[PDB]
Ligand binder design. Sequence first.
Ligand SMILES: [Cl-]
Ligand SMILES: [Cl-]
Length: 164
Amino acid sequence: MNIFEMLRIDEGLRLKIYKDTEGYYTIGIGHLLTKSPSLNAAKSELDKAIGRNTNGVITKDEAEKLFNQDVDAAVRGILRNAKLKPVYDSLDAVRRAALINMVFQMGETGVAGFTNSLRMLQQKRWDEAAVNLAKSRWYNQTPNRAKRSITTFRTGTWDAYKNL
Ligand SMILES: [Cl-]
Ligand SMILES: [Cl-]
């Protein structure tokens, strides 16, 4: 298992523009296009992202290319963030993947906000961090997905994804 496989499980793959859990226009493997309520604005962002006139539909290869870029960006955002970097540095390989997942889903800013959980992960207080992470809008709105990342942080294994 790895970050790519992990996020592919969590986000799925759609080749036509769709609405995510929050109602925002997205495509491919969880690639957010825009928060604007306009399909056109979404179509325009899509074209700009792919480099051609798509008409809201892309190929699998195109989807994967956005995905690679998005994962790269997530890692880079973590390493550039003063609050995130130290945490990430302190963690093992499996847990690092969970941190990337959260950033991919909510953005660097969002995750940097989980101050207390972050301190707990840095301290390696797994059970406690898991409890704190659960007290969030994030867990309440997307419980199954959040639970998978939380378990990953708790156990340091891929057990939550084995079967999926
Ligand atoms: Cl892009
Ligand atoms: Cl969910």
